[PDB]
Amino acid sequence: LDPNAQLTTSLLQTYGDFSLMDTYRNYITGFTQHFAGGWNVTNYAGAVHHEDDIARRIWDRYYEVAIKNLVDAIHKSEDKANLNAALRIHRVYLLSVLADTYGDIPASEAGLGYISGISNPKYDTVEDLYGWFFTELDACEQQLGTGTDHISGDVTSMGGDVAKWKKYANSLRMRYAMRISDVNPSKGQEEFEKAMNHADGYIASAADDAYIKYADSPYTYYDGANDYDFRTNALGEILYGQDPSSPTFVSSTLFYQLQNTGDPRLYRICRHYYNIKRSQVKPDKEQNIDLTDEVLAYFQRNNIGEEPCNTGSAWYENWMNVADAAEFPTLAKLAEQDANSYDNSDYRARLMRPCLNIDFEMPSCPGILITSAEVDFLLAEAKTKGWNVSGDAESHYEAGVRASMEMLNNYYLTSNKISEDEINAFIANNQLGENPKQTINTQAWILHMMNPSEAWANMRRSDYPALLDRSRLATFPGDGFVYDDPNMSMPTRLRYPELEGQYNSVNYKAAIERMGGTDDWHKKLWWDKSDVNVQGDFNPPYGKGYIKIGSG
Ligand SMILES: OC[C@H]1O[C@@H](O[C@H]2[C@H](O)[C@@H](O)[C@H](O)O[C@@H]2CO)[C@H](O)[C@@H](O)[C@@H]1O
Numbered sequence: 001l002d003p004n005a006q007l008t009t010s011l012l013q014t015y016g017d018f019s020l021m022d023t024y025r026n027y028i029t030g031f032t033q034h035f036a037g038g039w040n041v042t043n044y045a046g047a048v049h050h051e052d053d054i055a056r057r058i059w060d061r062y063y064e065v066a067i068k069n070l071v072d073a074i075h076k077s078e079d080k081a082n083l084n085a086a087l088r089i090h091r092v093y094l095l096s097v098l099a100d101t102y103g104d105i106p107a108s109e110a111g112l113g114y115i116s117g118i119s120n121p122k123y124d125t126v127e128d129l130y131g132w133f134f135t136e137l138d139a140c141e142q143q144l145g146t147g148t149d150h151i152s153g154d155v156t157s158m159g160g161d162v163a164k165w166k167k168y169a170n171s172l173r174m175r176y177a178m179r180i181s182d183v184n185p186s187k188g189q190e191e192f193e194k195a196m197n198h199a200d201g202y203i204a205s206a207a208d209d210a211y212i213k214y215a216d217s218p219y220t221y222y223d224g225a226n227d228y229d230f231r232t233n234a235l236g237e238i239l240y241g242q243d244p245s246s247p248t249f250v251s252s253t254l255f256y257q258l259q260n261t262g263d264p265r266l267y268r269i270c271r272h273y274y275n276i277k278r279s280q281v282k283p284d285k286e287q288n289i290d291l292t293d294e295v296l297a298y299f300q301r302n303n304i305g306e307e308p309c310n311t312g313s314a315w316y317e318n319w320m321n322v323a324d325a326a327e328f329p330t331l332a333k334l335a336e337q338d339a340n341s342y343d344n345s346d347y348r349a350r351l352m353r354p355c356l357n358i359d360f361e362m363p364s365c366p367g368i369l370i371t372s373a374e375v376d377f378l379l380a381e382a383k384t385k386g387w388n389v390s391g392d393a394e395s396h397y398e399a400g401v402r403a404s405m406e407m408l409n410n411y412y413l414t415s416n417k418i419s420e421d422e423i424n425a426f427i428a429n430n431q432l433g434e435n436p437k438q439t440i441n442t443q444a445w446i447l448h449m450m451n452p453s454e455a456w457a458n459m460r461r462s463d464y465p466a467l468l469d470r471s472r473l474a475t476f477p478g479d480g481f482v483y484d485d486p487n488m489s490m491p492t493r494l495r496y497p498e499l500e501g502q503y504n505s506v507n508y509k510a511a512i513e514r515m516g517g518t519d520d521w522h523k524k525l526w527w528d529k530s531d532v533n534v535q536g537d538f539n540p541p542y543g544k545g546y547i548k549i550g551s552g
């Protein structure tokens, strides 16, 4: 009821609501090809399988909680200009996620009547929404600091500092100006330069990174869905999984991007776990038994190597030979003590695959809004476009790579931090090269691994990184997965919630007619001009690659 408390709830929901995270585990982080091998991502993204109850969650949960709270608090804060501006900025942020997910969405008519359930809003067009983002963020950025009120509900890294909220608003303007740079290059350039030249500045260093701060509190997964306090980061929670036999595995797309470039992030992101006794309350190092070094030593002894799971395949598909516990001295000692716990062959099978480091799965992980590393990559790309940016593209790109590594050191890694020498060597071996747009946006995709909505939006916009071509990778109908969409390319949006067809029937129909007459998750959004690039060949040294030509 207090508008600062409504700001708090709406900020925390962003990453703190487990009941929308199935959309991120099952679809979006699979679409981006960061993760593959878990059952959930294989069944949904991996099979290009639409299910309304999964696809609808970002829409239903953000409109039911955050948008209702924000709209109510905005109406009730006209006397508190600083809070009012912060509420409106977070509303822009969430509406941009909603529009980048679904396309045309309720916004301009999503007011007091709509959140009370008595009014049907039209769906604003993506083009009109993006235009409004620029005017609203300009207005909010100037309104910040014209109040004397304390933004006491701020749970972000901005810590109620209006100067930091101003830099955040200008950085969002820069992101959205890049987003529209293919469909409207002149507006993109104008808006980008206006924001980057603004007297109040943008996020230029990690000290001004914008993220939501989450607490070290126990995980509860789907339990108590009615009573969510949103205090912990539910993205890392769902990636850890409610089921120890289905943790999140790193895809071959991400694995080979890292390995092929000598990226020191390879075995910071990827670890090998034997996790049968792991805590579900809070990921623990004691029983997420990290056997990475011993697994790599076994590979070296046997002239073999990693088999990261391909997009479309589960860990139990494209079966990788399972080493005996005797191959890993730590596990061998444990199994000689207690075979029921430590000689389980299913848990040893999952030990063979590269797993996401539990450092990315802890309750207190930050919820990234926008980082200085992203802004560095935006400046690098703007320079390559010929926009009026200070400093050469190489300098901005190198700043972005360095800041992406330091982000891991500062926000995630609890051990084995990436050294300055490792960063400098990686940068020296990975310059912009012949296709700077590809290099910049592939590095940004690594940066956005824990910010899946931005990863997916920027990949759709820039069409990089080149993904694995799903149509050239195996399917597994004999394993119970359903392949009901003959177009296997990565979806470019999600379908609208099907209940909208009843609950807001006229406006749902009109939005669907505008995209050509069916609710098509292969239809590109207004700012998405071209198809994402795909890798022309994939023949990994171990495991399975593209199916052999002519065998399909
Ligand atoms: O056990 C079946 C299935 O459950 C999935 O979680 C459900 C959850 O039980 C339900 O309360 C919620 O409303 O929906 C989610 C998503 O369907 C779980 O994610 C799956 O791993 C599991 O196969």
Ligand SMILES: [Mg+2]
Pocket: 459, 460, 461, 462, 463, 528, 529, 530, 531, 532
């Ligand atoms: Mg595209």
